[PDB]
Curated annotation (Swiss-Prot), chain A:
GO-annotated cellular components: CMG complex; DNA replication preinitiation complex; GINS complex; nuclear replication fork; nucleus
GO biological process, one term: DNA-templated DNA replication
Purpose of the protein: Functions as part of the GINS complex which plays an essential role in the initiation of DNA replication by binding to DNA replication origins and facilitating the assembly of the DNA replication machinery.
Protein name according to UniProt: DNA replication complex GINS protein PSF2
Quaternary structure, from the entry: Component of the GINS complex which is a heterotetramer of SLD5, PSF1, PSF2 and PSF3. Interacts with PSF1 and SLD5.
Keyword Nucleus attached: yes
Taxonomic source organism: Saccharomyces cerevisiae (strain ATCC 204508 / S288c)
SUPFAM superfamilies cross-referenced by the UniProt entry: GINS helical bundle-like (SSF158573), PriA/YqbF domain (SSF160059)
Family matches, as Gene3D superfamilies: 1.20.58.1020, 3.40.5.50
Localisation: Nucleus
Swiss-Prot record, chain B:
This protein's name: Cell division control protein 45
An example molecular function term from Gene Ontology annotations: DNA replication origin binding
Keywords: Cell cycle, DNA replication, Nucleus, Phosphoprotein
A Gene Ontology term for the protein's cellular component: DNA replication preinitiation complex
Curated annotation (Swiss-Prot), chain C:
Main location group: nucleus
Function: Required for DNA replication. Functions as part of the GINS complex which plays an essential role in the initiation of DNA replication by binding to DNA replication origins and facilitating the assembly of the DNA replication machinery.
Gene designation: SLD5
Protein name: DNA replication complex GINS protein SLD5
Compartments in which it is found: Nucleus
GO annotation (BP), single: double-strand break repair via break-induced replication
Biological source species: Saccharomyces cerevisiae (strain ATCC 204508 / S288c)
Swiss-Prot record, chain D:
Biological function: Required for DNA replication. Functions as part of the GINS complex which plays an essential role in the initiation of DNA replication by binding to DNA replication origins and facilitating the assembly of the DNA replication machinery. Required for the chromatin binding of CDC45.
Full protein name: DNA replication complex GINS protein PSF1
Lineage of origin: Eukaryota, Fungi, Dikarya, Ascomycota, Saccharomycotina
Gene Ontology biological-process entries: DNA strand elongation involved in mitotic DNA replication; DNA-templated DNA replication; double-strand break repair via break-induced replication
Localization annotation: Nucleus
Subunit details: Component of the GINS complex which is a heterotetramer of SLD5, PSF1, PSF2 and PSF3. Interacts with PSF2.
Domain of life: Eukaryota
Family per record: Belongs to the GINS1/PSF1 family.
Entry's Gene Ontology cellular component terms: CMG complex; DNA replication preinitiation complex; GINS complex; nuclear replication fork; nucleus
Keyword Endoplasmic reticulum among record annotations: no
Organism in which the protein naturally occurs: Saccharomyces cerevisiae (strain ATCC 204508 / S288c)
Remaining remarks: Present with 1431 molecules/cell in log phase SD medium.
Key word Transcription regulation present: no
Keywords: Cell cycle, DNA replication, Nucleus
Length: 181, 553, 221, 104
């Protein structure tokens, strides 16, 4: 009996999910281990980038034995083209990593000192792109009908927050209408 | 007696295992230095992710309950601030188990002199004596290699005469005052820099450690500023602000003041409760209280503006805060106020003076929280320890302020009652030394804690002597509420007015042990510190008479 | 057949499970090779952890890594089955009516786990036994049977195939079902005209219209 | 349930006798029912716990007036009021449900 939530995912569970996405790293180190699902790696070379899963990068970052790379889409100069492209298409939600909220929480807790110009900038940027996008969702949510919605490109977290609401009142709405014919 | 890095690699090799680990680091006890030390220690362990137990010990007698009860798999032990005085080899016993002994108890202490049985005869230590007193210290060196293992009648008489010859000079040693050489924290940082960690909050832990004790002397600390300031120079958040910026945003040098709570309290209340200024200006006196206002008349600072909280005072007064004091304070003899201090700014929250933070933690330790009652109380202090431990963390500031709203109140208590004493002139000059007892007072609940009486005792020994000719004489205090006449009595040390020639080596430690060894009348060394003991009102008076004579100083 | 793929399919199954209004087939072919695999590595790590102490008069990292990993994947399936058992708790009756009927596929050894089947029958049994000595004594003659009257109803519910589920469309293109303009799939709702479906965009609809896409794993949930 | 080493169903469910015995028979039969699921895996579970995913993976537990030491499994954590153990998520899951541990 899962109790909470249960129909929607838990906010934590979507991080539990996203940490399964691989991203590049800069190992300080120069057994085996096969583990199960990793496939990697031959002993990591210091000052050499390589591709590994996230939860291990985070794990090895707590010990500061590795320096995570910043994603090419996580930058303020990069985000600028994205909010510029977002203000100008009030309908569509543009192009999203789909994890961007949760990577934006996770990579800022520890890895923060690795980013170039992380301070007081990107958080200001993504807290914004997580603003106009949210209100655009609430103003795109007036057009609700059964059964269709284009939620286009939308974050996993954004999906998860509003899920019970939409997929509940769709189940009051479509419920009268299917049944009245 | 070892390299810090190498003692570290030892505590590494005996540590990590299946199951992990096991080590219990003992944080002890009520001294803020302990926190300062063991927090950067614990963070260092978390770095290599080495499992640990951490115990809040209060009583020295209490340690026996722990070490004798729960130990199973623990091959490497660590202890803090205990054992420098009384040896645990006899106290715990040990009983050697399995050379290359399985368990290594590290003992970190700032207290001197070390116990004789400790450093020589390696069993449980692995001593931390390094590097402060190395020394020699040839007096302890000849104490053993001679003693151990030690016509024929003249050679026997010669031998015995030599034995007593060493025993006399040896008796000079280990009978002596307990005085901290250097803050244990500093050394943990010396151990830490060899491993290569420069971490900022770590360094702040060092600053906290050093500034834990400036309330009481320095003594070497006056020369510790190089060893800190250089480190503050070994790093920097940004070459120039770049206001603020919201992150790093770190500690910096500012003209800080022994003045009390300048930043988190109203200015006037900040002079009026400050400890150094209580003294020179005679603030317990109504006639002297005015002299403060004359200070403000000299500064041109409104009385109404002095009453207002420091966050909100006008900007002009802030920019002139470092000048006006130079223009004026010099005239009142208050010229020693301005230190070069350390202040860490969290930015949009505020800033915090190195010292004031320590006032917050101390504040936390006593408040904001027949043997069953004392155990339960000491227990309440044990819980309260963690309430104080948490405030060190950066991520929770919300409770740190709960400390400060207390730190103010305590003074408002302490000062008040402190004045309640000087009105009755309760000081007994006696002959050999100064002595006092509080027979009655408001809210003795605050005075239960050793450290509360350390600070009241401190403002009082500071008040009585400016100096104030003549003869700085150590002070004695006593208080009672409940627990059936426990009458806690703490030893104290004299305060020189910033011109300090000698350490002076508190002698109450010895004078108390002489009485425990005489009639031992309800005398209890149960508190971890040699200066502070317990007594009963039945036996306190004969104890006071036996305290008066024979005077060891 | 690769470990990573079995895992991706495990995650896929887990999400598809917590999303959908109803129960899904029990995937034994995989879940059993993982239930063997973890029994292997959990023994292996304790063996290497115990052999490690022999070289001791180094680096705990691959052991810590490994162990954390095993905590994560031993969490995953435990969420899975702890969820399915709940949906069995809700659908016990429906499943019973699904079992008594011939068509189409009953519980068997497939639709439920060889472990789950026990949970089902025993729970069902002790439940009926509870309500039996509690409120049916005192037993209505028409209400002797737990099943449709009909109305209302009962249970029956809830094989609800119309409920909404967020769906994200993914799968290999041949360049099967792609009719343009962007891509697969149909759709053809009964009540409405096709949208139809675009692959780079998540589209919320009923579970019933998409159940076949779900079977093919051409759309994630 | 409750949880290590369950090891028996006791002191739980403050309703106790106030709740009907007819339900309690169902209940004891039900936890007896789940003991078999515990006995199939072999996973292992460890199922009753860890509804919330491990991170990462070591935590800090602050004692909450518990005695102690009752930590026999794996190792003798030697429970001691006013003592925090820098212990892995493993035994934390099991011991937090009882009421010993407090801050994760």
């Amino acid at each position: 009996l899962p109790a909470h939530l249960q129909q929607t995912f838990s906010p934590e569970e979507i991080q539990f999910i996203v940490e399964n996405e691989p991203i590049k790293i800069f190992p300080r180190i120069t057994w085996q281990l096969i583990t199960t699902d990793d496939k990697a790696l031959n002993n990591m070379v210091a000052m050499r980038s390589t591709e590994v899963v996230l939860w291990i990068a985070l794990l090895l970052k707590q010990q500061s034995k590795c320096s995570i790379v910043a994603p090419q889409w996580l930058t303020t100069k990069e985000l600028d083209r994205k909010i510029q492209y977002e203000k100008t298409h009030p309908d569509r939600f543009s192009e999203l990593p789909w994890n961007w909220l949760v990577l934006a929480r996770i990579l800022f807790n520890k890895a923060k000192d690795d980013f170039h110009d992380p301070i007081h900038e990107l958080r200001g940027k993504i807290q914004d792109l997580r603003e106009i996008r949210q209100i655009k969702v609430l103003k795109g949510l007036k057009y609700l009908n059964e059964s269709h919605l284009q939620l286009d490109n939308l974050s996993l977290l954004e999906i998860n927050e509003l899920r019970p609401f939409i997929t509940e009142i769709m189940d009051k709405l479509r419920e009268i209408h299917t049944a009245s014919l | 007696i070892s390299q810090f890095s190498e003692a570290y690699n030892k505590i590494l090799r005996n540590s990590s295992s299946a199951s992990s680990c096991q080590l219990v680091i003992f944080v002890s006890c009520l001294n803020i230095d302990a926190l300062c030390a063991t927090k950067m220690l614990s963070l260092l362990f978390k770095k290599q992710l080495v499992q640990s137990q951490i115990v809040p010990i209060f009583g020295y007698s209490e340690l026996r309950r722990h070490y004798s009860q729960l130990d199973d798999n623990i091959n490497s032990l660590l202890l803090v601030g205990f054992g420098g005085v009384i040896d645990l080899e006899a106290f715990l016993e040990i009983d050697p188990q399995e050379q290359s002994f399985r368990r290594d108890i590290y003992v970190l202490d700032a207290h001197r002199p070390w116990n004789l049985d400790n450093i020589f005869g390696s069993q449980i230590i692995q001593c931390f004596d390094d590097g402060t007193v190395d020394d020699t210290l040839g007096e302890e060196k000849e104490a053993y290699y001679k003693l151990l293992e030690l016509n024929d009648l003249s050679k026997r008489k010669q031998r015995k005469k030599q034995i007593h010859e060493y025993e006399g000079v040896l008796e000079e040693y280990y009978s002596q005052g307990t005085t901290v050489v250097n803050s244990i924290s500093a050394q943990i940082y010396s151990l830490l820099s060899a491993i290569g960690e420069t971490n900022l909050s770590n360094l702040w832990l060092n600053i906290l450690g050093t500034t834990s004790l400036d309330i009481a002397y320095a003594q070497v600390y006056n020369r510790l500023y190089p060893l800190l300031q250089d480190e503050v120079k070994r790093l920097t958040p940004s070459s120039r602000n770049s206001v603020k910026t919201p992150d790093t945003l770190t500690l910096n040098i500012q003209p800080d003041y022994y003045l009390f709570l300048l930043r988190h309290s109203s200015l006037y209340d900040s002079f009026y409760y400050s400890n150094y200024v209580n003294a020179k200006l005679s603030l317990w006196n109504e006639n002297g209280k005015k002299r403060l206002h004359k200070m403000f008349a000299r500064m041109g600072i409104p009385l109404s503006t002095a009453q207002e909280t420091w966050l909100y005072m006008d900007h002009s007064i802030k920019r002139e805060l470092g000048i006006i004091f130079d223009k004026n304070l010099d005239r009142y003899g208050l010229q020693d106020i301005i230190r070069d201090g350390f202040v860490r700014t969290l930015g949009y929250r505020g800033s915090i003076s190195a010292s004031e933070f320590v006032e917050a933690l101390t504040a936390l330790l006593e408040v904001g929280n027949s043997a069953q009652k004392l155990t339960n109380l000491r227990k309440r202090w044990v819980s309260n320890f963690w309430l104080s431990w948490d405030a060190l963390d950066d991520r929770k500031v919300e409770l740190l302020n709960r400390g400060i709203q207390l730190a103010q109140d305590l003074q408002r208590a302490i000062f008040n009652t402190g004045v309640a004493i000087l009105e009755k002139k309760l000081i007994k000059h006696l002959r050999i030394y100064r002595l006092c007892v509080l027979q009655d007072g408001p809210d003795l609940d605050l005075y239960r804690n050793p450290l509360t009486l350390l600070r009241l005792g401190n403002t009082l020994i500071e008040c009585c002597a400016e100096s104030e000719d003549k003869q700085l004489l150590p002070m004695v205090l006593a208080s009672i509420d409940e627990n059936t006449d426990t009458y806690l009595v703490a030893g104290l040390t004299p305060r020189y007015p910033r011109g300090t020639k000698k350490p002076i080596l508190n002698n109450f430690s010895m004078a108390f042990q002489q009485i425990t060894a005489e009639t031992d009348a309800k005398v209890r060394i149960d508190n971890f510190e040699s200066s502070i003991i317990e007594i009963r009102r039945e036996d306190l008076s004969p104890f006071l008479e036996k305290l008066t004579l024979s005077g060891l100083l | 057949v690769s470990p990573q793929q079995d895992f991706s399919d495990l995650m896929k199954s887990w999400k598809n499970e917590r999303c959908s209004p109803e129960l899904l087939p029990y995937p034994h072919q995989l879940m059993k090779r993982l239930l063997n695999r973890i029994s292997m590595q959990s023994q292996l790590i304790e063996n290497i952890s115990m052999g490690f102490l022999d070289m001791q008069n180094e680096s705990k990292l691959p052991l810590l890594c490994m162990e954390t990993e095993l905590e994560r994947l031993k969490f995953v399936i435990r969420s899975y089955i702890r969820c399915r058992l709940s949906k069995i708790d809700k659908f016990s009756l429906y499943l019973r009516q699904l079992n008594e009927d011939e068509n189409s596929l009953i519980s068997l050894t497939d639709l439920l786990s060889k472990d789950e089947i026990k949970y089902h029958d025993t729970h069902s049994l002790i439940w009926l036994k509870l309500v039996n000595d509690s409120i049916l004594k005192y037993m209505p003659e028409e209400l002797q049977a737990i099943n449709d009257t009909e109305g209302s109803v009962n249970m029956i519910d809830e094989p609800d195939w119309n409920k909404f589920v967020f769906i994200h469309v993914n799968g290999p293109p041949d360049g099967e079902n792609e009719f343009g303009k962007p891509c697969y799939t149909v759709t053809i709702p009964d009540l409405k005209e096709e949208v139809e479906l675009t692959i780079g965009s998540i589209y919320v609809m009923r579970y019933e219209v998409i159940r076949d896409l779900l079977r093919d794993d051409k759309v994630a949930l | 349930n409750g949880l290590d080493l369950m090891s028996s169903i006791t002191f739980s469910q403050q309703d106790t006798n106030n709740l009907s015995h007819q339900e309690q028979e169902y209940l004891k039969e039900y936890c007896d029912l789940i003991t078999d699921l515990k006995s199939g895996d072999l996973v292992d579970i460890d199922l009753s716990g860890s509804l919330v995913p491990p991170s990462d993976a070591f935590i800090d537990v602050r004692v909450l007036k518990d005695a102690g030491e009752i930590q026999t499994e794996y190792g003798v954590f030697n429970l001691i009021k006013d003592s925090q153990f820098f212990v892995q998520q493993s035994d934390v899951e099991r011991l937090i449900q009882q009421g010993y541990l407090q801050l994760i």
